[PDB]
Paper text:
Interactions between all complex components, including stoichiometry, remain uncharacterised; nevertheless, once assembled into their quaternary complex, the trio of Pqi proteins are anticipated to provide a continuous channel between the inner and outer membranes of diderms.
Initially, we overexpressed and purified a construct encoding the entire amino acid sequence of E. coli PqiC (residues 1–187) tagged with a hexa-histidine tag at the C-terminus, referred to as PqiC throughout. During purification, PqiC was observed to elute from size exclusion chromatography (SEC) at a volume similar to that of Aldolase (158 kDa) indicative of its assembly into a higher-order multimer. PISA revealed the interface to be stabilised by 12 intermolecular hydrogen bonds and a single intermolecular salt bridge between D68 and K166. Finally, we were unable to model the extreme N-terminus (residues 16–22) of the mature lipoprotein, also presumably due to inherent structural heterogeneity. We anticipate this arrangement to represent the PqiC biological assembly, which is consistent with its elution from size exclusion chromatography far earlier than one would expect for a monomeric species of ~20 kDa. Finally, the internal diameter of the pore formed by the octameric PqiC arrangement is ~40 Å and thus congruent with the width of the PqiB coiled-coil with which PqiC is anticipated to interact.
Author numbering:
A (entry chain A), B (entry chain B), C (entry chain A), D (entry chain B), E (entry chain A), F (entry chain B), ...: 23 to 187
Write the structure that this text describes.
């Protein structure tokens, strides 16, 4: 048995308060049943996949993505309070649905999905596709590159958030 | 065991929804139990079909159709915001039913169904049938052609949407 | 294993709108437990039946009847919007209960049931019995003649609908 | 395994319900668990019965009784509208209970029960017992005679209905 | 296997109406778990009982008692409408709980319980104990004497009802 | 397997409840899981007990206690109406808890508990312990003595009730 | 098998009434899953425990603690009405959570937890740790010392209650 | 099978909550399924962990964390009242999430997470990571160090609380 968990990070000891508002609530990262299960997958063909047997998630993938996104956004938004729990009526909402989170026959690892943001009536939706390479052909390197690309797309979302005050 | 999933396309930097009218919600695409089952269907006679036991959907087919439809509509409606979740009050609703999504014994592939749309009170209903050809013997080519036909019908829905004031 | 599904049809590309109203909602085609199951049946005597073993429905019979009736009424009512989903408060309702959907010892295939329609307080109920013959003694021909007689009774209902503007 | 179902009779072109008063709803006919079970009962002594293990109802007996009652009442009440579903506000309600629906060791068949009806506030209650004779040794003849007695009691209910202003 | 059912009776063709009111609703005859089960019991000692193996109830004892009480009260109250279903707001209520329904080591068969009646605020409660003898030592005779004593206590309740207009 | 049940005593012609104040409702007597289990308990040491596997309650002990309490209270309160179901608005409530209902290794039997009563707003709380002696070796004698002690405590409750204005 | 139950006590025949108020409601004694189960435990190390196999609770530990606390508080608060059931709106509330209820490698038996009291807005919370010794190394003595220390902490709570009129 | 539980510390005579402002409620500490499982985790590589099958939590880890946090906060906030249950209206809320609570293959132990607090409308969010060293080979020492780090983080939360007016 081999279980993997996305390394969750933290933003030091900033202790951000809601005095300057800037609230953010993160809903559940919706994921289809071929990634939402406990099985790590590796694209072997154009539409054919392969579910791993003993290479599983430590906790379900959607919860991992939600918590790591909350951590990455809290790190990459200094002065913002981002939480996976409801904050208030003046909070801005974020809904993420992941479409791909696997490797590929060429040794590449793909992340992709869509994210929507509600800011006081203004809704902004955007899809994303990103790729990384494995230095060593292993599930360990696969999950690590997955986490790296997850951090990349979290940084993209943080930039898009900081763009509109 | 082999698993197949329809590739969910994605665009680049998308638009916002502060206009309100550029909103569309794709409710879950309903399919009958012979398509709702996790097995791939192969039409062998006029009313006879065969469900493959070792060739399955990676995730349930209805969720795949809903997600791929949302992605295609988000691509060919750049000024709009198409989502698989509710988006507002003046948001538009799109209810799609799929009656056939399988191949035939003559080496061909069929996709048929219906769809209803609500544009600010006006309800528009349209059925559709489409037929493609898989050129190489294999379920992978069948799934590829199926995804292509699904994208073609999403483009048809986009064209019908753009035909309104 | 041999699974059968009623061939669902379509009405081209009419794109009927609710501007001229003419809404129709189709409730679930209620069917007793000797036909509502997955087992095709063949009347062997006056009250004795025979449930088939490997001759089953692709999807449950009631859902098949509901969807095929929606399709047949959409085809046979040009200018009407017929759906298996609620349309509005000004919609007319239709409730169908099937009593027989099998073959007979003489090679005949029987369809029968009752249908009720609500049009703004005016309720119209009517029973129906119809028969067809099988050119070849086979379950394939049986299901095909069943679909043909289903289309026949759908045409009867469409005429009864078009009778009262 | 042999399955039996009561033949559901049907009339031709029936009437409408714009008058309101010509409305009747047959609630689900209740039978005890010795009749609610899917097995055919054979009364062997005064209080002793035997439930056939290989001779069963095609669908549960209570639903069959409700449907056959609705059909018979729709036949012998041409000016009325009898349905197994609610029909309006001024609609009439018919609650039927069946206490015996089986054959006896002397070669005879028994059908007994009670029924209550609500006519515009006036509640009318009447019990009934009827006995027929099966002439040929077989469960098929028993079911035939049972259906005939059920039709006779439906005719009795129709006569009691027609006796009101 | 030997199943027994309390013979339910009827009151001819009186067709009692609610014009003279006299409504009666019968609640579920509550019975403890040593009689409420499917097992006929036979008192072998002061507090020791014996549950029969193949001598069972055709339908659960409480439903049998409720239906037979409804029938006996409808027979023994000419001009009253007694039902196991709610009748109206002006109806009188009856609640019965049986404590014993078995035979005894001496060949005697005991029935006992308590019944409460609500008539427009006036509540009348009363316990009862009654005994019968078996002419032949058999479960058949046991159930038959049980039904006879049930009719006896039903007659007692009918007298107590007719006592207070 | 041997089953035991406490004999539920019964009186003759009882009284009515038009006075309102002569009303009492016995809520379900609660016992812990070592008494709530269907097995008879035998106290072997100070805190050690043994649950008989083949000597069981005919019906769950708590329901037996509630019914026997209602019967005894109906006997020793002739002017009152004690029931196991709600009786009105000015009705009185009696909540009894039983902590011990078993025999001891010295050949003796124990019954202990508490009870609360609501008399027109005044809440009265009283605990109780009682000890009897079984004279002949056998679980039957134990159950007999247990029922006797239960009747004694019901008489105590009756005496406390009669002590109020 | 060896089952143990905390000896519940009683306060004679005081028959305390609510005329002088002094109500007390006891909520469920919340207990973690290593003590809340049916398994008696014995601390073998600093953080290592040992769950007993055949040394179990007669009824679940939390119910036992709740009932014994109700009894001890009723004994040790003369003139108060303490119950495990709601008493009224003017009642004072008590919430207890136990953290330890086991023995130790040195033969010591530890009880510990926290209790909170609500008296008309004034909330008073307090933790407690207490120890006892076993004269004989046995589970019997263990449960007995547990009950003794439970009585001790009940006396402490009774003193804290009597401190504030 | 070996079970481990974090020792829940306890103080002496604590304070009251009549002031209202000295109130804190610790909602249930949430951990992912790799920590929510009853098994102890041992981090073997960067993203690889191993869950011990025979070394388990005595009770679920999340409940243990909540209880130990409440106890520590009750110790280092003498003037406050910290509870695991709601305490009032002006009460403060503390939502803690734990992302890591396990040891590493270099002989070290990690505890990381986040926590949010609501002080009279002001929401304060802070993450934390802490690392200890187990000196003797054994899961017992690991659990000891884990409890120590948890107490250290509770002290950090107490310090952040005391930093407010």
């Amino acid at each position: 048995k081999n279980y993997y968990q996305l390394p969750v990070v933290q933003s030091g000891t900033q202790s951000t308060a809601s005095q300057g508002n800037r609230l953010l609530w993160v809903e559940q990262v919706t994921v289809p049943d071929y990634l939402a299960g406990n099985g790590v997958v590796y694209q072997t063909s154009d539409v054919k996949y392969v579910i791993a047997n003993n290479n599983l998630w430590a906790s379900p993938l959607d919860q991992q993505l939600r918590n790591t996104l909350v951590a990455n956004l809290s790190t990459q938004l200094p002065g913002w309070v981002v939480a996976s729990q409801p904050l208030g009526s003046a909070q801005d909402t974020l809904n993420v649905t992941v479409t791909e989170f696997n490797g590929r026959y060429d040794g590449k690892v793909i992340v992709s999905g869509e994210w929507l943001l509600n800011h006081q009536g203004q809704l902004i939706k955007r899809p994303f596709r990103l790729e990384g390479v494995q230095t060593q052909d292993g599930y360990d390197e696969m999950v690590k590159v997955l986490a790296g690309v997850w951090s990349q797309e979290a940084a993209s979302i943080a930039q898009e958030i900081k763009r509109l005050p």
